[PDB]
């Protein structure tokens, strides 16, 4: 039923093989015409004498949910402990899923995709070398702030923006289990669109491609602590897991490597790997 009710299930199993005998009939079950665009429904019992077999195999790791629902790394971002004079004391990331190769290829197998998402974020810190690198420092808290489209943007590590009166934020101290949020569905359409063939302007111009639809705000990252007598570099690795997925219209898998994350550009590659001869053992 509902795909947000996870305790409600269903059960089905792979088809069995029924025993058949020799024939000398006037019916051909293995002749068909490909032209039709119809895939043949031949089963082994149609061209061999088969025994009776019972299958208890069940397709269960090829469900869309089980396939997509594992936490993939989408991006990592780096930022030092600094002052207002530094321009690396905070950093930000424009949300997109096209940066990594692996997850991108998985998603792009479906034209339209509708899901809720669990965002987990692993922040790791390291001591930078300095003369005073044996300076003592206590534990560092980090702040992750989500800025929805068209909101105020930080210009420095310290300004009014960071007050977060209606922006979701996570404060996470080091040495604890990774920060995790769940996000509902959030499109203005009825599904996320992994491909858009069209233009941003009615005069057939501007931006071509998927870029036009994507717009999801940005994550601003900073340290909450005041600077110590030496810099500490932190790198936050962002993990995404699509749960409660529903998918429409399957597409061929990608073959050529990606080049850009704002368009589908590619340069042509060989169809498949060469082999020695047309007859090969």
């Amino acid at each position: 039923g509902d795909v947000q009710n996870a305790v409600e299930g269903a059960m089905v199993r792979v088809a069995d093989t029924v025993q058949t005998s020799a024939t000398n009939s006037e019916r051909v079950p293995n002749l068909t015409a490909v032209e039709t665009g119809h895939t043949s429904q031949a089963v082994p019992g149609d061209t061999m004498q088969t025994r009776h077999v019972i299958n208890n195999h069940v397709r269960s790791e090829s469900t869309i949910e089980n396939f997509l629902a594992r936490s993939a790394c989408v991006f990592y971002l780096e930022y030092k402990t600094g002052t207002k004079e530094d321009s690396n004391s905070f950093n930000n990331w424009v949300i997109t899923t096209r940066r990594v190769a692996q997850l991108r290829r998985k998603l792009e197998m479906f034209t339209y995709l509708r899901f809720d998402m669990e965002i987990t974020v692993v922040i790791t810190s390291s001591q930078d070398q300095s003369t005073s690198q044996n300076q003592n420092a206590p534990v560092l808290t980090h702040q992750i702030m989500y800025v929805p489209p068209g909101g105020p943007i930080p210009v420095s590590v310290d300004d009014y923006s960071w007050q977060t009166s209606t922006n979701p934020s996570i404060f996470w101290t080091e040495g604890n289990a990774p920060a995790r949020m769940s996000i509902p569905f959030i499109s203005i359409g009825n599904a996320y669109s992994n491909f858009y063939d069209g233009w941003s302007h009615f005069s057939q111009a501007g931006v071509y491609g998927f870029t036009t639809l994507n717009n999801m705000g940005q994550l601003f990252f900073r340290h909450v602590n005041k600077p110590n007598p030496a810099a500490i570099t932190s790198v936050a690795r962002i993990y995404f897991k699509p749960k409660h997925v529903r998918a429409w219209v399957p597409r061929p898998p990608r073959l050529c490597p990606y080049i850009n994350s704002t368009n589908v550009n590619f340069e042509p590659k060989p169809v498949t790997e060469v082999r020695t001869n047309i007859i090969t053992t």
């Binding site: 032209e35 119809h38 941003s200 005069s203 071509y208 850009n260 550009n265 590619f266 590659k269």
Partner: protein, 255 residues
């Protein structure tokens, strides 16, 4: 009975196509096109539905199949923009919705061979020949004139990458079959009929900005015949809109 399943008559509007060799008719994803319901409406204004006036078989341009030719594509609904009252309604309305009956016609005698894939790819976003470049409109469509594929990787500035084997979008051509398709294999049938329903992620859309699907005709087995047995064999693509309805009326224009 007296029936044969090789003869078919499709009558829609004031236009009838007959064919005496065909193999069935593929209804895209099992669903027959129909009007928008009142559970999926977003627009508040009363739709116009021109029925018979805008549903009927529009014969688009026909290209010649030759031994060396690599393939052709057209982009819908963009292609139909000069076709009669369909064109006019599309020009004066912000939102449009419609399904389509695609009927590709070709024929030859018994002493010819060759096999074309006929496939309707929804949402075909295409690359660019220069991979730092960006494609522009004129190399994406020529309206109702077919855009040709190429078999040579190099292409002009704002050229679209259109090397046959990667389908112009970076996927192995041999897998295109996952989308609604037929084959016109010369010896059996001589026409394809794909009834493509409206597929989009939103109930209605602007007909100019968005391109719903691309009709790709790719020759997998080259046209061949023995000497002195005719040398001209065209391929004519005829398409009919179904259940077309339009919301949002304002002055004509693009911008």
């Amino acid at each position: 009975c007296g029936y044969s399943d090789r003869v078919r008559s499709i009558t829609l509007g004031n236009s009838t196509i007959t064919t005496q060799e065909c193999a069935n008719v593929v209804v895209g994803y099992g669903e027959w096109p129909e009007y928008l319901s009142d559970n999926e409406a977003t627009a508040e204004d009363q739709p116009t539905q021109p029925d018979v006036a805008t549903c009927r078989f529009y014969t688009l341009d026909s290209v010649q199949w030759e031994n060396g030719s690599p393939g052709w594509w057209w982009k819908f609904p963009d292609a139909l923009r000069d076709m009669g009252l369909f064109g006019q309604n599309m020009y004066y309305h912000y939102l449009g919705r419609a399904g389509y009956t695609i009927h590709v016609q070709c024929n030859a005698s018994k002493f010819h061979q060759g096999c074309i894939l006929v496939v309707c790819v929804p949402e075909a976003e295409m690359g660019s020949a220069q991979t730092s470049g960006v494609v522009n409109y004129e190399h994406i469509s020529k309206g109702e004139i077919a855009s040709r594929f190429t078999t040579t990787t190099t292409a002009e500035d704002h050229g679209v990458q259109a090397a046959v084997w990667n389908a112009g979008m970076g996927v192995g051509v041999g897998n295109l079959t996952i989308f609604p398709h037929q084959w016109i294999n010369l010896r059996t049938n001589n026409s394809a009929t794909i009834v493509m329903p409206y597929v989009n992620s939103v109930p209605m859309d602007n007909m100019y900005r968005h391109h719903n699907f691309t009709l790709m005709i790719i020759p997998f087995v080259p046209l061949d015949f023995s000497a002195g047995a005719s040398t001209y064999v065209p391929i004519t693509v005829t398409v009919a809109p179904m259940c077309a309805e339009y919301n949002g009326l304002r002055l004509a224009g693009h911008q």
